[PDB]
């Protein structure tokens, strides 16, 4: 919504190259042990927390830097590497905040979060990016329009 | 099929009431017009899943208890020669309040997935308003977005 999109700012919480587990490899369509990138970001609008964003990037995009991610969006970084999004599959759910989430998002302990599980695909059906995101629902909701 | 759990529905409330300014605005009618409120509990097998709430405009305010026993709301609207063309949905999350936690068999203050829905027909007439909440361990909203 309007407030969330007003003044987007990002702080990187984690940026870590790691060996893809068989599970992660299968989801990305790559090989187990491949060098993939885990990123975790706190997204704000100005000083107001909005979301915690988590992604896995496959080896082709594992050189996305921490600085790129605090200066611009994930898709700015991906676009500079020739990515063209064709399909985004998203599953929207909800859950309680756990661990440090309520502190990072400045909400109540055990308070509700909106969740997104995301798989983004290019035109050849290859996985661009896997997302697992959570949003404070007073700052962000998902809007859709279906036409029969 | 052996592991499938069939959807179940029971009617909690079915009453004609005067449209508030907000409801009238959303339906495209006059404040105070006679609208139908329907509330239902939807379950999956034996497990409560969703509290469904709908408002129907005067044209459709005769949907009966009997037709809600025999089919859903859209079966009833189909009987009236009404077919859905457009659905706008807003997906959020919040805490369960009041009898919501006992209706859904969850914790008081536990998270709920929410949807606000406006359904329109091919003439752009609002057919139905929905305001639903779901146990998020039993239900998620799946979406696919295809870039052109």
Coordinates of C-alpha atoms in Angstrom, one line a residue:
Chain A
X1 CA 0.0 0.0 0.0
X2 CA 0.9 3.7 -0.1
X3 CA 2.8 4.1 3.1
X4 CA 5.0 1.0 2.5
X5 CA 5.9 2.1 -1.0
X6 CA 6.6 5.7 0.1
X7 CA 10.3 5.5 1.0
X8 CA 11.6 1.9 0.7
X9 CA 14.9 1.2 2.6
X10 CA 16.7 -2.1 3.1
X11 CA 19.2 -3.4 5.6
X12 CA 20.8 -6.7 4.8
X13 CA 20.6 -9.0 7.8
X14 CA 22.4 -11.9 6.1
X15 CA 24.4 -12.4 2.9
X16 CA 26.0 -15.9 2.8
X17 CA 27.3 -18.1 0.1
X18 CA 26.5 -21.8 0.9
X19 CA 26.4 -25.3 -0.6
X20 CA 22.9 -26.1 -1.8
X21 CA 21.3 -28.9 0.2
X22 CA 19.6 -31.5 -2.0
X23 CA 16.3 -29.9 -1.0
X24 CA 17.4 -26.4 -2.0
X25 CA 19.1 -27.8 -5.1
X26 CA 15.8 -29.5 -6.2
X27 CA 13.8 -26.3 -5.7
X28 CA 16.3 -24.2 -7.7
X29 CA 16.8 -27.0 -10.3
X30 CA 20.5 -27.1 -9.7
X31 CA 22.9 -29.7 -8.2
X32 CA 23.4 -30.5 -4.6
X33 CA 26.6 -28.7 -3.3
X34 CA 26.3 -25.9 -5.9
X35 CA 27.2 -22.5 -4.5
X36 CA 24.0 -20.6 -3.9
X37 CA 23.4 -17.3 -2.1
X38 CA 21.2 -16.8 1.0
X39 CA 20.1 -13.3 1.6
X40 CA 17.9 -11.9 4.4
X41 CA 16.8 -8.3 4.4
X42 CA 14.9 -6.0 6.7
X43 CA 12.7 -3.8 4.4
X44 CA 11.4 -0.5 5.8
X45 CA 9.6 2.6 4.7
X46 CA 11.7 5.4 6.1
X47 CA 12.2 4.3 9.7
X48 CA 9.1 2.1 9.8
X49 CA 9.7 -1.7 9.5
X50 CA 7.6 -3.4 6.8
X51 CA 8.9 -6.8 6.0
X52 CA 11.6 -9.4 6.4
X53 CA 12.6 -10.7 3.1
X54 CA 14.5 -14.0 2.5
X55 CA 15.8 -15.4 -0.8
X56 CA 17.9 -18.1 -2.3
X57 CA 19.7 -17.2 -5.6
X58 CA 21.1 -19.9 -7.8
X59 CA 24.9 -20.0 -8.9
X60 CA 24.2 -17.8 -11.9
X61 CA 23.3 -14.8 -9.6
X62 CA 25.3 -15.7 -6.5
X63 CA 27.5 -12.6 -6.9
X64 CA 24.7 -10.2 -6.0
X65 CA 26.5 -8.0 -3.3
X66 CA 25.4 -6.7 0.0
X67 CA 25.8 -3.1 -1.2
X68 CA 23.6 -3.7 -4.3
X69 CA 20.9 -4.9 -1.9
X70 CA 21.1 -1.8 0.4
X71 CA 21.2 0.6 -2.6
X72 CA 18.4 -1.0 -4.7
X73 CA 15.9 -3.9 -5.1
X74 CA 16.7 -7.6 -5.6
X75 CA 15.3 -7.3 -9.1
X76 CA 17.5 -4.3 -9.9
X77 CA 20.4 -6.6 -9.2
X78 CA 18.9 -9.5 -11.2
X79 CA 17.9 -7.2 -14.1
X80 CA 21.6 -6.1 -14.5
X81 CA 22.5 -9.8 -14.9
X82 CA 20.0 -10.3 -17.8
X83 CA 17.1 -11.7 -15.8
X84 CA 13.6 -11.4 -17.3
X85 CA 10.8 -12.6 -15.1
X86 CA 8.1 -14.7 -16.8
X87 CA 6.1 -16.4 -14.0
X88 CA 5.9 -15.7 -10.3
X89 CA 4.1 -18.4 -8.2
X90 CA 3.1 -17.0 -4.8
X91 CA 1.4 -18.6 -1.8
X92 CA 0.0 -16.1 0.7
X93 CA -0.5 -17.3 4.3
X94 CA -0.2 -16.0 7.9
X95 CA 1.5 -17.0 11.2
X96 CA 2.8 -15.7 14.5
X97 CA 6.0 -13.7 14.7
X98 CA 8.8 -15.9 16.2
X99 CA 12.3 -15.2 17.5
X100 CA 13.6 -11.7 16.8
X101 CA 10.9 -10.9 14.2
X102 CA 8.7 -9.0 16.6
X103 CA 11.7 -6.8 17.6
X104 CA 12.9 -6.3 14.0
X105 CA 9.4 -5.5 12.8
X106 CA 8.4 -3.5 16.0
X107 CA 5.2 -5.5 16.7
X108 CA 3.8 -7.5 19.6
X109 CA 5.3 -10.8 20.6
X110 CA 3.4 -13.6 18.9
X111 CA 1.7 -11.0 16.7
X112 CA 0.3 -11.9 13.2
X113 CA 2.4 -11.7 10.1
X114 CA 1.3 -12.1 6.5
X115 CA 3.6 -14.6 4.7
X116 CA 4.6 -15.1 1.0
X117 CA 6.3 -18.2 -0.4
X118 CA 7.5 -17.3 -3.9
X119 CA 9.1 -19.1 -6.9
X120 CA 10.1 -16.8 -9.8
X121 CA 10.7 -18.4 -13.2
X122 CA 12.2 -17.2 -16.5
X123 CA 10.8 -17.9 -20.0
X124 CA 12.7 -21.2 -20.3
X125 CA 11.2 -22.4 -17.0
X126 CA 14.4 -22.0 -15.0
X127 CA 14.2 -20.8 -11.4
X128 CA 15.4 -17.2 -11.0
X129 CA 14.9 -16.9 -7.2
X130 CA 13.1 -18.5 -4.3
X131 CA 11.5 -16.2 -1.7
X132 CA 10.1 -16.6 1.9
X133 CA 8.9 -13.3 3.1
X134 CA 6.8 -12.0 6.1
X135 CA 5.1 -8.6 6.4
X136 CA 3.4 -6.7 9.2
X137 CA -0.1 -6.7 8.0
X138 CA -0.9 -3.2 9.1
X139 CA 1.8 -2.0 6.7
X140 CA 1.2 -4.4 3.8
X141 CA -1.6 -6.4 2.2
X142 CA -1.8 -8.4 -1.1
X143 CA -4.2 -7.2 -3.7
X144 CA -5.4 -9.2 -6.7
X145 CA -7.8 -9.0 -9.6
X146 CA -9.3 -12.1 -11.2
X147 CA -11.2 -11.8 -14.5
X148 CA -13.3 -14.9 -15.4
Chain B
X1 CA -8.9 -39.8 -2.9
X2 CA -8.5 -41.9 0.3
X3 CA -6.7 -39.1 2.1
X4 CA -9.0 -36.3 0.8
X5 CA -11.1 -34.4 3.4
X6 CA -14.5 -33.1 2.0
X7 CA -15.5 -29.5 2.6
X8 CA -18.3 -28.9 5.1
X9 CA -20.5 -25.9 5.7
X10 CA -23.1 -24.8 8.2
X11 CA -25.0 -21.5 8.4
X12 CA -24.3 -19.3 11.4
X13 CA -26.5 -16.3 10.4
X14 CA -28.9 -15.3 7.6
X15 CA -30.6 -11.9 8.1
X16 CA -31.8 -8.9 6.1
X17 CA -30.5 -5.6 7.5
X18 CA -30.3 -2.0 6.5
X19 CA -27.1 -1.2 4.6
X20 CA -24.7 1.0 6.4
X21 CA -23.2 3.9 4.4
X22 CA -20.0 1.9 3.9
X23 CA -21.8 -1.3 2.8
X24 CA -24.2 0.7 0.5
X25 CA -21.2 2.5 -1.1
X26 CA -19.4 -0.8 -1.7
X27 CA -22.6 -2.4 -3.3
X28 CA -23.5 0.7 -5.3
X29 CA -26.9 1.1 -3.5
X30 CA -28.5 3.7 -1.2
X31 CA -27.7 3.9 2.5
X32 CA -30.3 1.9 4.4
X33 CA -31.3 -0.4 1.4
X34 CA -32.3 -4.0 2.5
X35 CA -29.2 -6.2 2.1
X36 CA -28.7 -9.9 3.1
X37 CA -25.9 -10.8 5.6
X38 CA -24.9 -14.5 5.4
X39 CA -22.4 -16.0 7.9
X40 CA -21.1 -19.6 7.5
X41 CA -18.6 -21.9 9.1
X42 CA -16.6 -23.8 6.5
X43 CA -14.7 -26.9 7.7
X44 CA -12.4 -29.5 6.0
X45 CA -13.5 -32.9 7.2
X46 CA -14.0 -32.4 11.0
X47 CA -11.7 -29.4 11.2
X48 CA -13.1 -25.8 11.2
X49 CA -11.3 -23.7 8.5
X50 CA -13.0 -20.4 7.8
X51 CA -15.7 -18.0 8.9
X52 CA -17.3 -16.8 5.7
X53 CA -19.2 -13.5 5.7
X54 CA -21.1 -12.2 2.7
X55 CA -23.4 -9.2 1.9
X56 CA -25.8 -9.5 -1.0
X57 CA -27.4 -6.5 -2.6
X58 CA -31.3 -6.0 -2.6
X59 CA -31.5 -7.7 -6.1
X60 CA -30.2 -11.0 -4.6
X61 CA -31.3 -10.6 -0.9
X62 CA -33.8 -13.5 -1.2
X63 CA -31.0 -16.2 -1.2
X64 CA -32.7 -18.8 1.1
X65 CA -31.6 -21.0 4.0
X66 CA -32.7 -23.9 1.8
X67 CA -30.4 -23.0 -1.1
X68 CA -27.5 -22.5 1.3
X69 CA -28.1 -26.1 2.5
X70 CA -28.2 -27.4 -1.1
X71 CA -25.3 -25.5 -2.6
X72 CA -23.1 -22.5 -2.1
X73 CA -23.7 -18.8 -2.7
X74 CA -22.6 -18.9 -6.3
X75 CA -24.8 -21.9 -7.1
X76 CA -27.7 -19.7 -5.8
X77 CA -26.5 -16.7 -7.9
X78 CA -26.2 -19.0 -11.0
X79 CA -29.9 -19.9 -10.5
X80 CA -30.6 -16.2 -10.8
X81 CA -28.6 -16.1 -14.1
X82 CA -25.8 -14.3 -12.4
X83 CA -22.2 -15.2 -13.3
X84 CA -19.0 -13.8 -11.9
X85 CA -16.8 -11.7 -14.2
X86 CA -14.4 -9.8 -11.9
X87 CA -13.2 -10.5 -8.3
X88 CA -11.0 -8.0 -6.5
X89 CA -9.4 -9.5 -3.4
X90 CA -7.4 -8.0 -0.6
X91 CA -5.4 -10.5 1.5
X92 CA -4.3 -9.6 5.0
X93 CA -3.8 -11.1 8.5
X94 CA -4.9 -10.2 12.0
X95 CA -5.6 -11.7 15.5
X96 CA -8.7 -13.8 16.2
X97 CA -11.1 -11.9 18.5
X98 CA -14.5 -12.7 20.2
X99 CA -16.0 -16.1 19.3
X100 CA -13.7 -16.4 16.3
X101 CA -11.2 -18.6 18.2
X102 CA -14.0 -21.0 19.5
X103 CA -15.7 -21.1 16.1
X104 CA -12.3 -22.1 14.5
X105 CA -10.9 -24.1 17.4
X106 CA -7.7 -21.9 17.6
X107 CA -6.1 -19.7 20.3
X108 CA -7.6 -16.4 21.3
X109 CA -5.4 -13.8 19.7
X110 CA -4.0 -16.4 17.3
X111 CA -3.3 -15.4 13.7
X112 CA -5.9 -15.4 11.0
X113 CA -5.5 -15.0 7.2
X114 CA -8.1 -12.6 5.9
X115 CA -9.7 -11.8 2.5
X116 CA -11.8 -8.8 1.5
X117 CA -13.5 -9.5 -1.8
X118 CA -15.8 -7.5 -4.2
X119 CA -17.3 -9.6 -7.0
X120 CA -18.7 -7.9 -10.1
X121 CA -20.6 -9.2 -13.1
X122 CA -20.1 -8.5 -16.8
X123 CA -22.0 -5.2 -16.6
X124 CA -19.8 -4.0 -13.7
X125 CA -22.5 -4.5 -11.1
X126 CA -21.3 -5.6 -7.6
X127 CA -22.9 -9.1 -7.1
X128 CA -21.4 -9.9 -3.7
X129 CA -19.1 -8.6 -0.9
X130 CA -17.1 -11.2 1.0
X131 CA -15.1 -10.7 4.2
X132 CA -13.6 -14.0 5.3
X133 CA -11.1 -15.3 7.8
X134 CA -9.1 -18.6 7.7
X135 CA -7.1 -20.7 10.1
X136 CA -3.7 -20.2 8.3
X137 CA -2.5 -23.8 9.0
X138 CA -5.5 -25.1 7.0
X139 CA -5.6 -22.6 4.1
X140 CA -3.4 -20.4 1.9
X141 CA -4.0 -18.2 -1.2
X142 CA -2.1 -19.5 -4.2
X143 CA -1.5 -17.1 -7.1
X144 CA 0.2 -17.3 -10.4
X145 CA 1.2 -14.1 -12.2
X146 CA 2.3 -14.4 -15.9
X147 CA 4.3 -11.5 -17.4
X148 CA 3.3 -10.8 -21.0

